[PDB]
Write an enzyme that holds these catalytic residues in place. Sequence first.
Site, PDB file in Angstrom:
ATOM      1  N   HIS B 125      30.615 -31.699  25.904  1.00 11.23           N
ATOM      2  CA  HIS B 125      29.255 -31.386  26.333  1.00 11.23           C
ATOM      3  C   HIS B 125      28.883 -29.974  25.961  1.00 11.23           C
ATOM      4  O   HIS B 125      29.576 -29.024  26.338  1.00 11.23           O
ATOM      5  CB  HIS B 125      29.093 -31.580  27.846  1.00 11.23           C
ATOM      6  CG  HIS B 125      29.395 -32.961  28.303  1.00 11.23           C
ATOM      7  ND1 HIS B 125      30.691 -33.420  28.490  1.00 11.23           N
ATOM      8  CD2 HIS B 125      28.595 -34.009  28.599  1.00 11.23           C
ATOM      9  CE1 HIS B 125      30.661 -34.675  28.874  1.00 11.23           C
ATOM     10  NE2 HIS B 125      29.397 -35.067  28.942  1.00 11.23           N
ATOM     11  N   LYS B 152      32.273 -39.153  22.344  1.00 10.35           N
ATOM     12  CA  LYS B 152      31.025 -38.825  23.052  1.00 10.35           C
ATOM     13  C   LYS B 152      30.667 -37.364  22.864  1.00 10.35           C
ATOM     14  O   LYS B 152      31.434 -36.459  23.200  1.00 10.35           O
ATOM     15  CB  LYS B 152      31.105 -39.134  24.552  1.00 10.35           C
ATOM     16  CG  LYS B 152      29.819 -38.740  25.272  1.00 10.35           C
ATOM     17  CD  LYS B 152      29.923 -38.894  26.795  1.00 10.35           C
ATOM     18  CE  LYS B 152      28.687 -38.314  27.474  1.00 10.35           C
ATOM     19  NZ  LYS B 152      28.864 -38.183  28.936  1.00 10.35           N
ATOM     20  N   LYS B 296      -4.042 -30.807  16.747  1.00  5.54           N
ATOM     21  CA  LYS B 296      -5.026 -31.659  16.081  1.00  5.54           C
ATOM     22  C   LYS B 296      -5.654 -30.954  14.898  1.00  5.54           C
ATOM     23  O   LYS B 296      -5.646 -31.454  13.776  1.00  5.54           O
ATOM     24  CB  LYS B 296      -6.121 -32.088  17.056  1.00  5.54           C
ATOM     25  CG  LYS B 296      -5.652 -33.037  18.125  1.00  5.54           C
ATOM     26  CD  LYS B 296      -6.781 -33.413  19.053  1.00  5.54           C
ATOM     27  CE  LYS B 296      -6.302 -34.431  20.063  1.00  5.54           C
ATOM     28  NZ  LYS B 296      -7.417 -35.193  20.633  1.00  5.54           N
ATOM     29  N   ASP B 334     -10.847 -39.710  17.503  1.00  2.61           N
ATOM     30  CA  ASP B 334     -11.464 -39.072  18.672  1.00  2.61           C
ATOM     31  C   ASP B 334     -12.989 -39.214  18.654  1.00  2.61           C
ATOM     32  O   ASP B 334     -13.608 -39.385  19.704  1.00  2.61           O
ATOM     33  CB  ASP B 334     -11.095 -37.582  18.757  1.00  2.61           C
ATOM     34  CG  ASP B 334      -9.710 -37.332  19.372  1.00  2.61           C
ATOM     35  OD1 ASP B 334      -9.266 -38.119  20.246  1.00  2.61           O
ATOM     36  OD2 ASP B 334      -9.066 -36.331  18.971  1.00  2.61           O
TER      37      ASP B 334
HETATM   38  O1  LIG Z   1      -1.782 -39.395  24.260  1.00  3.35           O
HETATM   39  C1  LIG Z   1      -2.727 -38.731  24.566  1.00  3.35           C
HETATM   40  O2  LIG Z   1      -3.020 -38.364  25.752  1.00  3.35           O
HETATM   41  C2  LIG Z   1      -3.727 -38.184  23.478  1.00  3.35           C
HETATM   42  O3  LIG Z   1      -3.627 -36.796  23.436  1.00  3.35           O
HETATM   43  C3  LIG Z   1      -5.161 -38.515  23.835  1.00  3.35           C
HETATM   44  C4  LIG Z   1      -6.136 -37.944  22.802  1.00  3.35           C
HETATM   45  O4  LIG Z   1      -5.965 -36.558  22.835  1.00  3.35           O
HETATM   46  C5  LIG Z   1      -5.771 -38.566  21.408  1.00  3.35           C
HETATM   47  O5  LIG Z   1      -6.617 -37.995  20.441  1.00  3.35           O
HETATM   48  C6  LIG Z   1      -4.288 -38.198  21.067  1.00  3.35           C
HETATM   49  O6  LIG Z   1      -3.933 -38.818  19.857  1.00  3.35           O
HETATM   50  C7  LIG Z   1      -3.351 -38.786  22.141  1.00  3.35           C
END
Ligand SMILES: O=C(O)[C@]1(O)C[C@@H](O)[C@@H](O)[C@H](O)C1
Lengths: 498, 498
Positions: B125, B152, B296, B334
């Site tokens: 571990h 393991k 994003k 979105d």
């Molecule tokens: O899993 C989520 O809460 C998300 O963040 C919700 C929204 O933000 C989507 O655009 C993401 O791809 C996934």
Amino acid sequence: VKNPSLICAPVMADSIDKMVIETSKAHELGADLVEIRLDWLKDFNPLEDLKTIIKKSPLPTLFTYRPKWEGGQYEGDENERRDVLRLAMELGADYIDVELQVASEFIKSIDGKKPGKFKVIVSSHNYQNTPSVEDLDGLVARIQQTGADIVKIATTAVDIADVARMFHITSKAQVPTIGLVMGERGLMSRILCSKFGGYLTFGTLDSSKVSAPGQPTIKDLLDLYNFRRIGPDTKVYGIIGKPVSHSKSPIVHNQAFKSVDFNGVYVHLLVDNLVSFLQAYSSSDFAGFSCGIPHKEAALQCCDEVDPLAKSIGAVNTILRRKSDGKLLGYNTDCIGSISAIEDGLTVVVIGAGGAGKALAYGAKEKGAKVVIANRTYERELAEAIGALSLTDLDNYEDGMVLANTTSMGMQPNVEETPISKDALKHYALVFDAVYTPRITRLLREAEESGAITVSGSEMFVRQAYEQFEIFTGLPAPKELYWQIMSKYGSRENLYFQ
Amino acid sequence: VKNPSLICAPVMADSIDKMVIETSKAHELGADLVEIRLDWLKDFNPLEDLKTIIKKSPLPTLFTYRPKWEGGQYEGDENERRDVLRLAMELGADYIDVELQVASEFIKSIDGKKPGKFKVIVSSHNYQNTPSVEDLDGLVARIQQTGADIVKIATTAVDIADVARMFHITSKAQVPTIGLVMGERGLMSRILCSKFGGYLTFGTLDSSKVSAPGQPTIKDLLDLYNFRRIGPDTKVYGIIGKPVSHSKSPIVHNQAFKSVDFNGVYVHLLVDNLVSFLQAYSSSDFAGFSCGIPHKEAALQCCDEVDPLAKSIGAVNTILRRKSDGKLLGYNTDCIGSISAIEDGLTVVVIGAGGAGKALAYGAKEKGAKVVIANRTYERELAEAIGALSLTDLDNYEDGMVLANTTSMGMQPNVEETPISKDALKHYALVFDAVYTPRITRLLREAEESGAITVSGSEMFVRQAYEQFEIFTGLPAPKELYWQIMSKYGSRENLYFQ
Ligand SMILES: O=C(O)[C@]1(O)C[C@@H](O)[C@@H](O)[C@H](O)C1
Ligand SMILES: O=C(O)[C@]1(O)C[C@@H](O)[C@@H](O)[C@H](O)C1
């Protein structure tokens, strides 16, 4: 910052009545306060149970209701969790710990509603690493901005060098700071709080009751590491090694320091990388080191000056940082400790060709009958340098010889490992094992029933240790004291400090 | 290597009778075996208690007597600890786990004395990090050399990229290997064992009963992540984000995959660094990603091709890895999910100027009345790019307006955080909150009692999600299915997957 560090006992019993007993035990052991881990209660009746604890605890109370998302056990409604903490406050808690993530909201909720004695700890727990000073500063600033009374930052030690950054934060942050580094490599951070400005440290009721990795017991903090005597000017010493958790060097040197009222403290130093370690802790704060496996031979290189006996041996087991320069002076106390222990027991076979083997080999050629070397790796060369054999053949080898193990073989937890077959032992008058943990190794056990004379590791250990004291303190080695200390405080088996 | 991964339930109750009940519960939940953590028993009578457990357990038994020096609770004599494990073996245990440190000695002790069904796990571990492939290989080889039946290796995730090395080890080591990475960032390693050759994974009886960081429940392994359906050819998808533990994307996509018998699995991807993540997992094994906060806007850059709507928005929330090239294609679901949810609810004020704010702003200017932007940092520019305001002033602002939160404000555990004062709300006809965890945010709660129309995050969430399904699978979005799944499996609050 301000006061010596408090010692807080985590209280994690899964019932209210057992918690009450634990707070009493905390008072008994000498803790300054208790952290009630409400998230560990299996059945919890907040109003009734909070009242009971606050009434019955002999110590100031810190309440924590730790959610799953911050390493805790609580699952469920977030507002209900906060309600409990608010209730704890108004029922007379001395502290609550609230998580940085929700601290702004929470402290807004009790604005102008806090009792006079009451303080809010706002905490952040990092289970990955220990961030840069830059990032820790930003973390302090964020926690301050929630309106925290006390900042709590727990990080994780990837390397022992990490602790220095945490010391810098507790040392210089102008706000009461609980700053702790988790993991065996962060243990030093829990011990030296009173030197480096830490507000609080956690010590366990006993080793089975750990609430985060690396916490020592309250009893060890107080009695082993002499916690209350540690101050801003205390000099730090330690045993550099890997592993390190078996070492009783902190037991003996801290008793001795305390006995002669020397302002020093000795800790375990689990060191992966010697060079980086000595660089990370180059300040006057860190005044000397004992060097264990695997760093003895190595330390000879990191020292600026090296004692003749140490150069002649090729290994350093003791490092002193000179007040003058800041420069590292290397010594070897393994040689005389090994030889004297053996002589007192009364051609020699030296098992191992590391730092200890070097010292024992060298001193053996100097004092009468002389020496055969035996090692795992055959090349370890040594036998030529002082006038060889591999342990594959060691079983195959006069009938009044002396055997001297200087490896870690047989050391806890490898208690059934022996470096040589029992049958070969009746060809030996005396057998010395540098391993003192456990006191009776398999080697020494079998050697005794082989009729031979047994000299244990402790005979060597105590001797090399009071010589390190002399180097460390400049005070005459209190030899009788070190024997007394080892007998009274160094006799328990299967101890791990980690 | 060989068979699908077993699911083992850690049994840690502190009394023998409670352990027996836990093994029954394990059988009930669907576990394949139990790990009896003997070091957690407060009172232990080895001969009597071992016999009871082995007799009464409905599942194959793995016994572990974990010492303090390997992260366990046992303190005391080492030979006595080994005696218990040997006893477990001869009383009919299916496995024992013995620590690498003493494994050679131990396996020597039972040589030619092992029962027919009996296997020895030898474990290591690592609570610091996840070593290089080089070092893991050496670790495997060392464990093999003790005479282990099963290797393991548990390591620690400093970054999610660490898990790939563990997958390579379980995938290619020609010996049965239990290979797991601890910590929230290692969670993926516990789920995908059956794809990458892992012998076993640990799943908890419930979240309060975790024996090492990051373990999911048995119920989630089986019902949420569809553990039994994961195989060598299963394609891996996941939600890339920080934080990630609130996301119900794995709940809905795994149900859908299973419902249409698509060979895919969807996990949480706690990602600190997007670029390094996509580089670490570039293989065909990893076929697509959802992108959440804060990645994003960033993901738009890492994509090789970008859908027009996504380029026009400036943010990617969905990434597909093309089978052809190996190249990343970026999309945005979105926009239509936000707009459609709002329209169905029936000038707009968009809170936040991240990826979601971008999408919602863009789509709002396209479909009728148009848009004011409000954000923490005022510069977030957006308002000019589509035709501004800071939330310091948002409270200060027609009487039939539309408000749309697209930030994480109000998201669990920040349930009392709202992006706007309740007083300003009666100047709004409708309010949309992208936050769907919790379902009723403070924002939506106060907005409803402000008379306004409330459209919840789930309306947006489900819509953008079945569009991601279509992108991921190439199968027509089963919209009615995704609504049904969210209703039946996506309704519970305060869930953290970590
Ligand atoms: O899993 C989520 O809460 C998300 O963040 C919700 C929204 O933000 C989507 O655009 C993401 O791809 C996934
Ligand atoms: O603390 C120990 O066990 C030691 O390792 C004992 C011996 O190896 C000494 O030379 C070291 O300085 C300390």
